[PDB]
Design a binder for this molecule. Structure first.
Ligand SMILES: Nc1ncnc2c1ncn2[C@@H]1O[C@H](COP(=O)(O)OP(=O)(O)OP(=O)(O)O)[C@@H](O)[C@H]1O
Ligand SMILES: Nc1ncnc2c1ncn2[C@@H]1O[C@H](COP(=O)(O)OP(=O)(O)OP(=O)(O)O)[C@@H](O)[C@H]1O
Ligand SMILES: [Ca+2]
Ligand SMILES: [Zn+2]
Ligand SMILES: [Zn+2]
Lengths: 738, 146, 48, 49
């Protein structure tokens, strides 16, 4: 509100804030020397945080060289004598926390309870010249130190860390905003230098989002990134998902929909971290149930290692199977026993017998782990897509599925179910769509279609041998099972387990697991994908080759029948071409595997009244098949493989010249050293936008700032106009007001 | 220097110095670098080829054992595929140096109640190995050099 | 090259305007900007 | 990195590098926050005494 902001700007608020800063700076030092009024100190720090929040709110929509920013910097330089004490109070305790636990400080402690033995704390702090005399005296005073030496550094260092974290972060954000808005002011450089110890501490936590502002201009947004939100973002199972998301968006994402896909990916990875949250190690009938729940987490949290173990087992089984031998007699008609060639040790057969069992056990464990790990993700994605199709672009009320996709028809089953949004966060999608489309269309018919209780029953919010056998949603379970069975990975794992079971019937069925799992590696995965990449062309080229061979077969059958003789034993004839099927099979089987076409296998036509015709026949067969169609097929496969490998590098090299959010990447921002790196790591960072989304989701609606409320409202209605267009706050303000 | 010393023990050890220093020139230096350029792909493609031919060896050992005869002297059998190691070695050694796959070396399946199965076996061996995997390896090497 | 010429024509539109020349270096600064310039102002079907 | 640790605490560590006073520079740069005696022992130079 511009009017109220100017009203507080032109008022007596600044004097009140100056007095508050003075009293707070003095009381922070006074209250820390006894450790008895700790609650009063915590409340004082909370009030300081509230004041800093008010000051930050005063700078919501300020122009780069705004009047309010200059008034605030004048206010700070007026009361520098207390701001310095506040900053020193933060920095001294941060440095004390850093020093305690190091090696130089630990070189002075000799007691076996963890006591520095005051009168050597001063020496320890003076060995490393960081503080001064009064600072060390203040630190000594703030310690407990009974019996003349009992300073417990473990609690002394951590006593003032937690209470002062919020106020420290808030003042760091305020200083960063003021410095970044009015940079041509030497009166703030000293403040920045004196606050370098807290500014560098909250470097990984301080976010920085640039958005399209409320009225017409780009605005920068500062927030807090939780330590857990960044620890789970650096998990190995997150970077590859991000890379896959960029691969898909860059290649087959196009434009005008990149932001929607990005937001969907943000929600998907939020659900991924939600799944990973309960997968961590700490996490009569009841004991068995809790033991089973604990057991069904080692497989899920450690699932790829089970795949590697299955691969190793398959390789060992195949290496053992390499020693098989066949003979007409047992080792001790048409017997043909398949016994084993025990070279020097008789333990090979028991090893094979055991490995056959552990392979099946590992396959079952792998499929269970996949069921408990990656199935909720696809269920959540399907439910979210269905809900957002229902409530925004209604597909089963206004429109109808086109009967060409089985997904739309199958998604009609999960409707009218008491537990339709079992994985999606939004449990009130039914009420939303009822209130959105229940007026133009039949309210009763919509309630019947969605299966929810009518307004008569659920008007407002006025307010395990039996549970697992009676409280089961049969329709929802059928729909979920269909969705799971449609998944490619689940089908592959089911086939793996089925053939592992079949390998007990015959030991040679374990050979397919040698090939089917070796493709899980990165390099060999595209080799098979190349075959199906040109799928609509391979089959058609092979059909053209077959048609050409058929035409040559017809020509040979009609005229050159006498030449196709393949035996000389006085039972001569052995006519390969005396039947159209036999002639076609002869031409297809060996007419293309020969290096010179069909002419190599048939007899010579020298002086047979058809020499020129058969010479033309052979030459044109060779030229048209061997050196043309086979070359075309080879080129198709190799070119598909090459383009598949090149698309994996185009997306890796496209970012290095373009910006993923605001468009132009490096033709305007690389004019300064590390310019692209700065524009990526400070202003426009996709991970930072994801963190902002998580922060908005976690934050209460009553605590939202004006910009936060604006962004949240646009997100709830699925409008992405707040994402930066071809502007980055530097083409507008930093172009002239640098 | 070590192999120069060893060349006095046997005079034929001086032959390697003909090759090892001829690559010091600019043009031939990248020929060797091409092989190690796609090092993480060449070994893996060769392993895929070995696995595929191993599957074909398993199939031949189980069903088409009677066809792998390579001698006619009244000491006939000479069974190439009567041991998994021997069958695999036969498929490795001459199943890929042949221009038409393994079908060129084995006897004809004409009228042996398995004619279509063995025809499919030979055709798919030829197509999947000779004109696909060898071409992929060749393309990898030549593209790395280019 | 015959297969590639069938793909070059399918990607020249996405950066150039069929009528007035410049297609996307001046009109895509706004979201759906190229789509708007194609579907509202310069549409060949509309000229037909 | 592990093999470079042997060349430390050597009387003639910068035998080819021009800067023969890198040990003194790093001692004066990091000898206060960390142990001066331990840094001198690690770099093998004679103490200030
Ligand atoms: N918001 C962004 N705008 C533009 N480019 C970006 C953005 N975020 C990332 N990039 C690009 O991505 C690069 C860094 O991210 P990327 O994940 O590609 O690499 P990386 O950090 O080395 O990989 P990783 O962390 O996945 O192992 C940047 O140098 C830049 O080219
Ligand atoms: N007047 C125009 N100026 C510039 N580009 C145009 C114009 N008309 C069409 N285009 C291009 O063509 C695209 C849409 O037409 P196009 O026929 O190529 O695709 P389509 O509508 O998906 O196909 P179709 O209707 O033939 O199945 C636009 O996105 C744009 O790239
Ligand atoms: Ca509020
Ligand atoms: Zn940008
Ligand atoms: Zn135009």
């Amino acid at each position: 509100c511009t009017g109220n902001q100017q009203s507080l700007a032109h008022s007596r608020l600044w004097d009140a804030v100056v007095g508050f800063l003075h009293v707070f700076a003095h009381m922070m030092m006074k209250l820390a020397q006894d450790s008895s009024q700790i609650e009063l100190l915590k409340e004082l720090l909370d009030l300081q945080k509230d004041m800093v929040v008010m000051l930050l709110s005063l700078l919501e929509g300020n122009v780069v060289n705004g009047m309010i920013a200059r008034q605030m910097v004048d206010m700070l330089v007026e009361s520098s004598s207390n701001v310095e004490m506040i900053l020193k109070f933060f920095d001294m305790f941060l440095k004390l926390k850093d020093i305690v636990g190091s090696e130089a400080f630990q070189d002075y402690v000799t007691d076996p309870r963890g006591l520095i033995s005051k009168k050597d704390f001063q020496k320890a702090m003076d060995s490393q010249k960081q503080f001064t005399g009064p600072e060390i005296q203040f630190l000594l005073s703030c310690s407990e130190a009974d019996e003349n030496e009992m300073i417990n550094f473990e609690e002394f260092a951590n006593r003032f860390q937690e209470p002062a974290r919020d106020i420290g972060f808030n003042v760091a954000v305020l200083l960063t905003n003021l410095s970044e808005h009015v940079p041509h002011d030497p009166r703030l450089r000293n403040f920045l230098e004196l606050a370098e110890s807290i500014l560098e501490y909250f470097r990984p936590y301080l976010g920085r989002i640039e958005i399209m502002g409320a009225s017409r201009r780009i605005e920068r947004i500062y927030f807090e990134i939780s330590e857990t939100n960044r620890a789970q973002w650096e998990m190995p199972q997150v970077k590859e998902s991000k890379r896959q998301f960029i691969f898909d968006v860059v290649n087959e994402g196009g434009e005008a929909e990149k932001m929607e896909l990005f937001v969907s990916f943000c929600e998907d990875t939020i659900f991924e971290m939600q799944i990973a949250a309960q997968i961590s190690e700490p996490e009569f009938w009841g004991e068995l149930e809790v033991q089973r729940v604990k057991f069904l987490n080692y497989l899920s949290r450690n699932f790829y290692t089970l795949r590697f173990l299955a691969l190793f087992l398959a390789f060992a089984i195949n290496f053992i199977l390499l020693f098989y031998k066949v003979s007409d007699s047992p080792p001790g008609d048409e017997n043909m026993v398949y016994y084993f060639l025990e070279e020097s040790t008789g333990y090979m057969e028991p090893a094979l017998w055991c490995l056959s069992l552990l392979h099946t056990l590992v396959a079952f464990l792998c499929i269970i782990g996949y069921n408990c790990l990656k199935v909720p993700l696809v269920i959540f994605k399907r439910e979210k897509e269905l809900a957002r199709k229902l409530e925004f672009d209604g597909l089963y009320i206004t429109e109808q599925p086109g009967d060409d996709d089985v997904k739309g028809q199958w998604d009609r089953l999960v409707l009218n179910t008491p537990s339709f949004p079992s994985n999606y966060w939004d449990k009130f999608v039914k009420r939303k769509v009822l209130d959105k489309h229940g007026d133009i269309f039949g309210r009763e018919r919509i309630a019947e279609l969605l299966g929810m209780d009518l307004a008569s029953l659920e008007i407002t919010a006025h307010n395990g041998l039996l549970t697992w056998l009676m409280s089961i949603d049969v329709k929802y379970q059928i729909w979920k099972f269909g969705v799971i069975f449609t998944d490619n990975s689940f089908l592959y794992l089911g086939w793996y387990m089925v053939m592992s079971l079949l390998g007990h019937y015959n030991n040679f069925f374990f050979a397919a697991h040698l090939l089917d799992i070796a493709m899980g590696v990165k390099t060999l995965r595209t080799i098979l994908s190349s075959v199906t990449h040109n799928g609509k062309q391979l089959v058609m080229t092979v059909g053209l080759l077959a048609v050409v061979v058929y035409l040559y077969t017809v020509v040979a059958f009609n005229f050159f029948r006498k030449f196709y003789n393949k035996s000389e034993d006085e039972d001569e004839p052995d006519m390969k071409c005396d039947d159209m099927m036999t002639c076609y099979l002869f031409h297809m089987y060996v007419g293309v595997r020969a290096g010179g076409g069909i002419g190599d296998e048939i007899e010579d036509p020298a002086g047979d009244e058809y020499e020129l015709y058969r010479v033309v026949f052979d030459i044109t067969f060779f030229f048209f098949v061997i050196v043309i169609l086979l070359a075309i097929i080879q080129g198709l496969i190799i070119d598909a493989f090459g383009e598949l490998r090149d698309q994996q590098e185009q997306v890796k090299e496209d970012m290095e010249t373009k910006c993923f959010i605001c468009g132009i990447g490096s033709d305007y921002f690389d004019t300064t050293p590390h310019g692209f790196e700065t524009h990526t790591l400070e202003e426009h960072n996709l991970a930072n936008y994801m963190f902002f989304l998580m922060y908005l989701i976690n934050k209460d609606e009553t605590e939202h700032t004006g910009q936060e409320s604006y962004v949240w409202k646009m997100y709830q209605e699925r409008c992405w106009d707040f994402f930066p267009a071809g502007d980055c706050f530097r083409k507008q303000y930093e172009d002239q007001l640098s």
